[PDB]
Structures are given as structure tokens and as C-alpha cells.
């Protein structure tokens, strides 16, 4: 008789907050200290990278973890263990593709706050990870490689899970993302405070031996720097290890009058809260008494 709603879960909002902070934190410079008792003026700055983080309840509270096989994410849950913290999550900032995440226990699983509502995003959780390698231009044009027949394979597997969900008498098609912000249109993502943007046209044009995605690299570029340029260039950014595991997707479905048995899907769904959401779906915080 226990309720879970992954789509209204302040843990998501909360995590997002923290990630944001982690980012601002990573931009502010050190404030000079005062007093005769200061060891050094050198302050520690943690670089903007995926940090292992658990979320935890205070005393008098607790976290419920749903353990139902292929859990809906919303509604009742039967095998619900109660715990003090979540598993450790090393969250990755990205769009379109969920990276380095948890894999679906058995087979491909998809989730949406509603499926009839095409407005609501669909989160795909893969049961089998797909590798993807990306490199900083030796500083050789920034790009990413991917096992083709493996990816095509995945899309097919997904299509199936959608036919199941929308009546398998329908034809599934993937289109690239339409208009929007650059980050939303491309598959973008963090890599140590530098952000890749990747033309994923080749990733989302599927129907009825490796792939290469071209990428740009927007850099930090401020702030808090004006009238302060006396030193040299960056420290560890020659050929950054960005390669990772694709463990999910964010999708949205089209809704026009003239679409028949035929359904179109595209690459980027909602905001990044949805990323966190994909890891926190099986948890909930709640009070004791």
C-alpha cells in the first residue's frame, strides 16, 4: 500500500540545487583571509566533475527504497526496503543521453509521468550499456565514437518497448531534435568544466562499423576575472578522458493530427532534473513517528 511518485520528488529538485552550487563554487575565486593565524592563503577548489554522492535522511526521518522488479516509478510498490541513504551516485551533466547511470535490471525499461500525454518526457533506462569515446583536441577535432551495429541494435530494442506501450501495430521512427537551445538540440555534456556539443543527427535517424559525432567545445569563459590576467594557461586539459557509458535516453513524442499508427520520437526531453530523476526514481524521503 506504499506510494511512490518519481515525478514529484523534492530529492530531485534538491540534488539539482546541489549540482548548481557545485558549479558556482567551482567558479568563484578564493577570498583572501585575515588574522595572524592563517596557514596559507591557498584555498581548495574542487573541479567540476562527477562526484560520488549519497543522499541521507536526518534522525526522525527515513528513505524508502522501492525494490519491485521493473518498477513503474509511480503508484504502489510491494517490496519496499527502508534505508538511511541512497546508493552512491556520480551524476553526469548532459542532454539527450543519460551517461554513466544505473542499468535496467532485466530488459529495457521506459518511464513517463503519462504516455498519453505526449508533453511528458519519456525516460529510457537501458539494460545493456553502450560505450562512447570522446577526446579533447590535442592542445584532432573534438568528436565521439560509438559501436554502430550495437547502437542500431539498441534503437530497435527500444522501438519494441514502445510498440508494447503504444500498441505494436504502430511504426516507430526516430527524428533528430527540432528547434531549441543549442545544448538541447545537440547532445551536450560536461567534461571537467568544459562542455561538449554533439551533432546527434546520426543517432536519431532510424528505421528499417562505428559512428562518429562531431563536437564543439564551449569553455568556462568567466566569470569573476576582470582586470586579472597575470598567469599562464590551464593545467590538466591536453587530451581529457571523457569516454563514458550510455545508460539511458530522454525522449519526447510528436502529436499532430496527421500521424497514423506512426509515432515519431526525439532526443531531448524536459530539463536536467530529469537526469537526477532517472537515478532517484526508486527512492522517497518520509517522516517517522
Amino acid at each position, epitope marked *: 500500500t506504499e506510494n511512490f511518485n518519481m515525478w514529484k520528488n523534492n530529492m530531485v529538485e534538491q540534488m539539482h540545487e546541489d549540482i548548481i552550487s557545485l558549479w558556482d563554487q567551482s567558479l568563484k575565486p578564493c577570498v583572501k583571509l585575515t588574522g595572524g593565524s592563517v596557514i596559507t592563503q591557498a584555498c581548495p577548489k574542487v573541479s567540476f566533475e562527477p562526484i560520488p554522492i549519497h543522499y541521507c535522511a536526518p534522525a526522525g526521518f527515513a528513505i524508502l527504497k522501492c525494490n519491485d522488479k521493473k518498477f513503474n516509478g509511480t503508484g504502489p510498490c510491494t517490496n519496499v526496503s527502508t534505508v538511511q541513504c541512497t546508493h552512491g551516485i556520480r551524476p553526469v551533466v548532459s542532454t539527450q543521453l543519460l551517461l554513466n547511470g544505473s542499468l535496467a535490471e532485466e530488459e529495457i525499461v521506459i518511464r513517463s509521468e503519462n504516455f498519453t500525454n505526449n508533453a511528458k518526457t519519456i525516460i529510457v533506462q537501458l539494460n545493456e550499456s553502450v560505450v562512447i569515446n570522446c577526446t579533447r583536441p590535442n592542445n584532432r577535432q573534438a568528436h565521439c565514437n560509438l559501436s554502430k551495429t550495437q547502437w542500431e541494435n539498441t534503437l530497435e530494442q527500444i522501438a519494441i518497448k514502445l510498440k508494447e506501450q503504444f500498441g505494436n501495430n504502430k511504426t516507430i521512427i526516430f527524428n533528430p531534435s527540432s*528547434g531549441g*537551445d543549442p545544448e538541447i538540440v545537440t547532445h551536450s555534456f560536461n567534461c571537467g568544466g568544459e562542455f561538449f556539443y554533439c551533432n546527434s543527427t546520426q543517432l536519431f535517424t532510424w528505421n528499417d562499423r562505428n559512428i562518429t559525432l562531431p563536437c564543439r567545445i564551449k569553455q568556462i569563459i568567466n566569470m569573476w576575472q576582470e582586470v586579472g590576467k597575470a598567469m599562464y594557461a590551464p593545467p590538466i586539459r591536453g587530451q581529457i578522458r571523457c569516454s563514458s557509458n550510455i545508460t539511458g535516453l530522454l525522449l519526447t513524442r510528436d502529436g499532430g493530427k496527421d500521424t497514423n499508427g506512426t509515432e515519431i520520437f526525439r532526443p531531448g526531453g524536459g*530539463d536536467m532534473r530529469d537526469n537526477w530523476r532517472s537515478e532517484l526514481y526508486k527512492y522517497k524521503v518520509v517522516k517517522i513517528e
Partner: antibody
Framework: QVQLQESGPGLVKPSETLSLTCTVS????????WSWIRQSPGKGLQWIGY???????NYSPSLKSRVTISVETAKNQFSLKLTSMTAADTAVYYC?????????????????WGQGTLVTVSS | EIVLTQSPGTLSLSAGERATLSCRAS???????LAWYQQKPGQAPRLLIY???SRATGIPDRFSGSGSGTDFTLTISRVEPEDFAVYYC?????????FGQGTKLEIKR
């Protein structure tokens, strides 16, 4: 490309309220922020407020009391509501995407705009 | 809340000349949040420069942005006949988005 299209009554009687609708095509309201801006004849630009596709809003302080911005992602449009219209409210009203970027590391700016609608307050 | 004051109310020159429009904030402002827009008569404004010095896509490179802190500058290297427009600097801070009152650019011929 992404195109916005306002629409609504050219004329509004004094004290009554204003309703407008911007319609997006080429892109999707999802993931994005959406603003209304107005400009009086010969005057300058005034930001009215925005709404996140999520539904959370943020209004300009000097207008807060009279403004409502709704969204209907299902039909891919957002709307304005302005209370107690007076001659001082006669203006061209624009919808525009932004000013906040979809993601935190995006860019801050108002883009694609609408064409604007001229609303006249008169009996 | 911040107040943006633009450079000259009206600015008038011939084609080929260089135009300098400034924007001065009542307070200090991060460059990420400053933008410029060009409004030709009868039209909606068009994004010209975002993030102080970043050129919007499609915009002719004879436009450039500069400055930081309190003083910012839009610069047109070689004025054209159809660069005739009103020009607004804008910023977003503290949950509020304000504009300068604009600079009317007139062409001499």
C-alpha cells in the same frame, strides 16, 4: 527554425482584462523559458515576466499584481493575462523565448521573438 | 534593481563611419547577462549580441560587443544604410530583466 506567433484581441475596454497567446512552431515549449514583453508607442521596451515550461513563473515587480502567464505545452503555446487595462497599457506585446537558458550553462538572452500584437485600450 | 543608461540618446552618422553606443549600469554586472538588440522600425527587436561580446548567429560581423563591470559598448565598424534602428542593451539579474532606454541611430546622406 523556431517561430513564435502572438494572437489576441486588438481592442480591450478600460478596466477589463487582456488575453494573449503565443504559438510556437519549428521548436517546442518543452525545456524552455518564455517571456512576454511590451512596448508603448514611441516608448521603450518593458519586460513583463516569464514562465518555465514546468509552470513556475516570474513576473516584473511593477506589474506583479495584475499579471498571469499560463502555459499549455500540450498545444505548444503560452499566454498572457493583464488585469484592469487602461490607456497606459496600450502597447505592442511581444512573446519571446528566454531570457533564461534551458540549462544552467546555456546563454542568457531573448530569442526568437514574435511579431508583436498591437493592443489598444478603448471603449 | 539595476538601471541601464544608454550612451547617446540619439546618434547620427553617414554610411561607412564607425558607431559607438555605450551602456552603463547603476551597479556592477556580469558579462554573461548583458545583451544588445536591434529594432528596425515596424519590427520586433532582433538579438544582436549576447554575453556582452558574443555575436548572435546570422548577425553580420561588423557588429561587436565589449566591456564589463558597469560600462559596456556595442560597436559597428562600418555603418550601413539599413543599420538604421533603435538599439537596446539588456540585462537579467536578480530574477528581473531590464533594458536601457535605447539609442536611436540615424543615417546622414
Amino acid at each position: 527554425q523556431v517561430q513564435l506567433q502572438e494572437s489576441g484581441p486588438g481592442l480591450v475596454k478600460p478596466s477589463e482584462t487582456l488575453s494573449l497567446t503565443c504559438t510556437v512552431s519549428g521548436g517546442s515549449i518543452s525545456s524552455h523559458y518564455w517571456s512576454w514583453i511590451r512596448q508603448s508607442p514611441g516608448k521603450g521596451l518593458q519586460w513583463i515576466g516569464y514562465i518555465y515550461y514546468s509552470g513556475s513563473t516570474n513576473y516584473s515587480p511593477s506589474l506583479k499584481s495584475r499579471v498571469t502567464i499560463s502555459v499549455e505545452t500540450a498545444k505548444n503555446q503560452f499566454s498572457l493575462k493583464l488585469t484592469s487595462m487602461t490607456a497606459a497599457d496600450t502597447a505592442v506585446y511581444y512573446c519571446a523565448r528566454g531570457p533564461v537558458p534551458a540549462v544552467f550553462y546555456g546563454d542568457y538572452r531573448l530569442d526568437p521573438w514574435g511579431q508583436g500584437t498591437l493592443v489598444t485600450v478603448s471603449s | 534593481e539595476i538601471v541601464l543608461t544608454q550612451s547617446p540618446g540619439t546618434l547620427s552618422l553617414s554610411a561607412g563611419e564607425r558607431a559607438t553606443l555605450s551602456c552603463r549600469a547603476s551597479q556592477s554586472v556580469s558579462s554573461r547577462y548583458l545583451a544588445w538588440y536591434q529594432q528596425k522600425p515596424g519590427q520586433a527587436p532582433r538579438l544582436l549580441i549576447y554575453g556582452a561580446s558574443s555575436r548572435a548567429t546570422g548577425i553580420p560581423d561588423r557588429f561587436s560587443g565589449s566591456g564589463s563591470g558597469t560600462d559596456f559598448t556595442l560597436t559597428i565598424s562600418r555603418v550601413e544604410p539599413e543599420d538604421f534602428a533603435v538599439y537596446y542593451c539588456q540585462q537579467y539579474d536578480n530574477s528581473v530583466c531590464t533594458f536601457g532606454q535605447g539609442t536611436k541611430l540615424e543615417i546622414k546622406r
